Structures are given as structure tokens and as C-alpha cells.
Design a protein around this ligand. Structure first.
Ligand SMILES: *[C@@H]1O[C@H](CO)[C@@H](O)[C@H](O)[C@H]1NC(C)=O
Lengths: 29, 50
């Protein structure tokens, strides 16, 4: 069930394509 | 669209080709302010509005 998103303003870039590990950095955009 | 309701479209995240538009040989007017139209391909911006 998807009840999160209830808007549509200006958009920008959109991309579509044991244990798990992830790392998230954010630099210079 | 009409003049009082001029439409807008943003373009980004792609590879433009200004020379083809330059060499279409069909447009009547082409005025670019502040930039060299023949050197437009050798430039890189963040987003364009049509
Ligand atoms: C969407 O973001 C752009 C980026 O600056 C801004 O200029 C524009 O006003 C925004 N749109 C709305 C409806 O706020």
C-alpha cells in the first residue's frame, strides 16, 4: 500500500533502473 | 499556446545539439544575446527553458 506522496510541484532529475550494506555521501551536489 | 498563456518546458539531463537547429535552414529569425551561437556547443549550463 502506497500512502506517502500527495503533491506534485517542480521536479528535477529522475532516475529509473545474507546481509546488505550501504554508504550514502553527498558532496558538491 | 496563446501569447497571454505562453507555455514553458524545462530541459535538463541530456545532450543538446545546437548545430542542427542552426543549420535547419528553415527559420526566419535567429537572435542570440550574449552568447556566440556558433560556439553554443562549446558551453555547458545546468538547465534550459523553452
Ligand atoms: C521550482 O524550483 C525552481 C528552482 O529555483 C524555482 O525557481 C521555482 O520557483 C520552483 N517552483 C515552484 C512552484 O515553487
Amino acid at each position: 500500500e502506497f500512502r506517502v506522496y500527495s503533491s506534485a510541484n517542480n521536479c528535477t532529475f529522475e532516475y529509473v533502473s545474507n546481509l546488505r550494506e550501504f554508504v550514502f555521501k553527498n558532496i558538491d551536489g | 499556446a496563446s501569447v497571454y498563456a505562453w507555455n514553458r518546458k524545462r530541459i535538463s539531463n541530456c545532450v543538446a545539439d545546437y548545430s542542427v537547429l542552426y543549420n535547419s535552414a528553415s527559420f526566419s529569425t535567429f537572435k542570440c544575446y550574449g552568447v556566440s551561437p556558433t560556439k553554443l556547443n562549446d558551453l555547458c549550463f545546468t538547465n534550459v527553458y523553452a
